[PDB]
Amino acid sequence: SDEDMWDETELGLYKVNEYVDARDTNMGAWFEAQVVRVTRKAPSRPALEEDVIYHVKYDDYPENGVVQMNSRDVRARARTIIKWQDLEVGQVVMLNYNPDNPKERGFWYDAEISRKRETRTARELYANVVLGDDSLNDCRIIFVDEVFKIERPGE
Ligand SMILES: Cc1cc(C)c(N)cn1
């Protein structure tokens, strides 16, 4: 076996210099980052995206250094907002939530829209917010005009 051996690659799904979102595995949120190097472990195998290690710098956390990511924790940078009128229960989107202080600005989490209400006085959005392998149901989402479409690589 050769999990310890790696080489650079230019044939990862994401490329050096690409602006991406990268997911912190300790707290489950996505952050703006840039890919600075792409390596691939196990040179004995045919090239697999599962073997790619992305080396990223988080835009707002330079003190974290060059962080290594599994391919599942990198995706193209979110760029398109799904406006209020287009949001629907069941959509999985990236949105801003603060689990510790839910009235405040927080971090960017993936979330499944769970309830959408329009009353005479407010637009109310609720979502099941993903943290790692688990989710918090029915979080009230403050930032209803900044919900992002997730860029999926496809298959
Ligand atoms: C984590 C993240 C946040 C924003 C606002 C955008 N546009 C992309 N990624």
Side-chain angles (χ1 to χ4, degrees):
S1 298
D2 62 347
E3 298 302 302
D4 58 320
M5 296 318 277
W6 65 3
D7 297 310
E8 295 216 43
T9 181
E10 281 74 54
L11 301 179
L13 193 40
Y14 308 104
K15 311 299 189 187
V16 171
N17 299 316
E18 184 163 355
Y19 292 100
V20 294
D21 290 323
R23 181 161 45 195
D24 177 85
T25 57
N26 281 127
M27 38 84 73
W30 291 92
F31 294 87
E32 300 95 320
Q34 192 181 22
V35 180
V36 306
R37 184 185 298 271
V38 188
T39 55
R40 191 189 305 271
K41 67 180 168 63
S44 70
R45 276 202 279 276
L48 294 186
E49 181 70 10
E50 290 85 352
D51 285 327
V52 175
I53 295 167
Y54 292 101
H55 305 250
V56 309
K57 279 234 77 184
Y58 284 117
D59 290 12
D60 293 319
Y61 304 91
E63 68 269 22
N64 286 26
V66 183
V67 184
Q68 289 169 24
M69 325 284 316
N70 189 97
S71 40
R72 77 180 69 87
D73 294 319
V74 176
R75 65 191 180 203
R77 175 92 58 101
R79 57 178 289 200
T80 304
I81 289 173
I82 312 176
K83 295 189 271 103
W84 169 260
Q85 302 90 321
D86 277 312
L87 291 168
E88 295 179 59
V89 169
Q91 293 174 332
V92 180
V93 300
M94 192 186 66
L95 51 70
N96 192 282
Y97 183 68
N98 189 322
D100 295 320
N101 290 94
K103 316 302 271 163
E104 298 296 322
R105 192 75 167 184
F107 298 107
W108 293 96
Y109 296 94
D110 294 344
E112 178 191 44
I113 303 305
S114 61
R115 180 182 300 282
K116 182 190 181 187
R117 308 183 60 215
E118 295 174 306
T119 72
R120 273 184 333 222
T121 61
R123 292 171 306 146
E124 300 181 2
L125 190 66
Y126 302 79
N128 307 317
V129 175
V130 174
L131 316 161
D133 286 327
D134 211 3
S135 55
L136 288 148
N137 288 12
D138 293 302
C139 298
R140 176 70 183 284
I141 307 307
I142 300 300
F143 307 102
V144 306
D145 296 315
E146 298 170 73
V147 176
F148 280 85
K149 174 187 204 196
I150 291 169
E151 297 292 319
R152 285 182 189 80
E155 95 172 63

